[PDB]
């Protein structure tokens with residue numbers, strides 16, 4: 280198990296444009312295309328990302344390419360965020376994957392509002408952090424996925440993904 284396998288489980292793989300849990304046009308392995316309610320706008324974003332006229336359909340290779348870029352961009356974003364970087368750096372590799380998972384799902388900004396969880400995670404108060412993390416819109420809207428990510432934060436193991 281690793282960050283790529285973890286997010287592949289949580290996000291799935293779909294080669295046609297679909298709506299994510301929030302109703303936003305998405306493709307591949309959780310690659311958000313747009314928050315716009317326009318399908319044509321999403322197809323435009325897809326063509327831009329892939330570099331060809333896709334007509335709402337991509338290959339597995341293309342999906343995995345976007346997935347690579349998205350994971351890489353999530354990590355690089357964390358490291359350029361003044362609030363997230365110190366907490367991330369303080370974590371072990373397993374919990375770092377849980378950190379990337381969150382940023383991948385809700386964006387950098389969404390996570391930065393977990394100020395109290397971030398502090399508990401840096402202090403390594405794992406049970407407390409796990410309790411605080413679940414007191415969120417994130418947990419309430421996606422409980423099963425959030426439980427897995429929180430368990431990873433709590434334990435520093437891959438038990439929730441086995």
Ligand SMILES: CNc1ccccc1
Pocket residue numbers: 357363364366367377378379381382390393396397400
């Ligand atoms: C709580 N998730 C998270 C995300 C990014 C860096 C540290 C922690």
